[PDB]
C-alpha cells in the first residue's frame, strides 16, 4: 500500500545491515527459501541438483546468485516505492523466461524476514519487521501488476 517516511527509514536502516554482509545474507535467504518451500528449488535448473542444506551451503555459485538477487532487491528498496524502472526488467524475466508463480515471491519474502530475525536478533524488532513486511508486500503487489501488464496470470 503506501509506507510512511518513518517506515522507509526503518527499512533502509535494516538494509544497511544486509549491505554489510551481502553474500552471507543472500546465501542464507536462498537456502531458507529452498528449505521452507522446496518446490521453489525445482524452478532453478541451476541449483536443483543440490539435495541437502549442507550441499547448498557449499555451492559458491548459489552464493553468487544470492548476491545478484539482493543487489537487485536493494536497488528497488532504495527507490522507496518509485521502482517502476527496476520492476520492468525483473518482471519480464521472471514471468516470461523463468516462469515463476507470484506466490513464490511471498515465499522469498518470508525467507528474507526469517533471515533478518536469524542474523540480527536484538536489532530487528516489531517495528522493523512490520516496515520490512510492508516494503516486501508493495514489491510483490507491484511485480504482480507488471506480470498482468505482460499478459499473465501470476
Ligand atoms: C526478491 C525477489 C527476487 C529478486 C530480486 C530476483 C532477482 C533475480 C535476478 C536479478 C536474476 C538475474 C537476472 C534475471 O534473470 O532477471 C534472477 C534470476 C532468476 N530468478 Fe529471481 N529474483 C527474485 C525471486 C525469485 C524467485 C522467488 C524465484 C523462484 C522461485 C526466482 C527464480 C529465478 C531464476 C530461475 C533465475 C535464473 C537463475 C539462473 O539460472 O541463472 N527468482 N532473479
UniProtKB/Swiss-Prot annotation:
Keywords: Cytoplasm, Heme, Iron, Metal-binding, Muscle protein, Oxidoreductase, Oxygen transport, Phosphoprotein, Transport
First-listed, main subcellular location of the protein, grouped into a coarse class: cytoplasm
Modification type Phosphothreonine: residues: 68
Localization, UniProt: Cytoplasm, Sarcoplasm
Binding site for nitrite: 65
GO MF annotations, alphabetized: heme binding; metal ion binding; nitrite reductase activity; oxygen binding; oxygen carrier activity; peroxidase activity
Gene3D superfamilies: 6.10.140.2100, 6.10.140.2110
Residues annotated as domain Globin: 2-148
Reactions the enzyme catalyzes: Fe(III)-heme b-[protein] + nitric oxide + H2O = Fe(II)-heme b-[protein] + nitrite + 2 H(+); H2O2 + AH2 = A + 2 H2O
Modified-residue entries (Phosphoserine), positions: 4
Binding residues annotated for O2, in chain numbering: 65
PROSITE patterns: GLOBIN (PS01033)
GO annotations of cellular component type: extracellular exosome; sarcoplasm
Residues noted as binding heme b in the record, renumbered to the chain: 94
Reported impact of residue 122 to A: In metmyoglobin
A GO BP entry: removal of superoxide radicals
InterPro entries: Globin, Globin-like_sf, Myoglobin
EC number: 1.7.-.-, 1.11.1.-
Domain of life where this protein originates: Eukaryota
Top EC class of this enzyme: oxidoreductase
Quaternary structure note: Monomeric.
Family: Belongs to the globin family.
Function: Monomeric heme protein which primary function is to store oxygen and facilitate its diffusion within muscle tissues. Reversibly binds oxygen through a pentacoordinated heme iron and enables its timely and efficient release as needed during periods of heightened demand. Depending on the oxidative conditions of tissues and cells, and in addition to its ability to bind oxygen, it also has a nitrite reductase activity whereby it regulates the production of bioactive nitric oxide.
Entry protein name: Myoglobin
Organism whose genome encodes this protein: Physeter macrocephalus (Sperm whale)
Name of the encoding gene: MB
Amino acid at each position: 500500500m503506501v509506507l510512511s517516511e518513518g517506515e522507509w527509514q526503518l527499512v533502509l536502516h535494516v538494509w544497511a545491515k544486509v549491505e554489510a554482509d551481502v553474500a552471507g545474507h543472500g546465501q542464507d535467504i536462498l537456502i531458507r527459501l529452498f528449505k521452507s518451500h522446496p518446490e521453489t528449488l525445482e524452478y532453478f535448473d541451476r541449483f536443483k541438483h543440490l539435495k541437502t542444506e549442507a550441499e547448498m551451503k557449499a555451492s559458491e555459485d548459489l552464493k553468487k546468485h544470492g548476491v545478484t538477487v539482493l543487489t537487485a532487491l536493494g536497488a528497488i528498496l532504495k527507490k522507496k516505492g518509485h521502482h517502476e524502472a527496476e520492476l520492468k526488467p525483473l518482471a519480464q524475466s521472471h514471468a516470461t523466461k523463468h516462469k515463476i508463480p507470484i506466490k513464490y515471491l511471498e515465499f522469498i519474502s518470508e525467507a528474507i524476514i526469517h533471515v533478518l530475525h536469524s542474523r540480527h536478533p536484538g536489532d530487528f524488532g516489531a517495528d522493523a519487521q512490520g516496515a520490512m513486511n510492508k516494503a516486501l508486500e508493495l514489491f510483490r503487489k507491484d511485480i504482480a501488476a507488471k506480470y498482468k501488464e505482460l499478459g499473465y496470470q501470476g
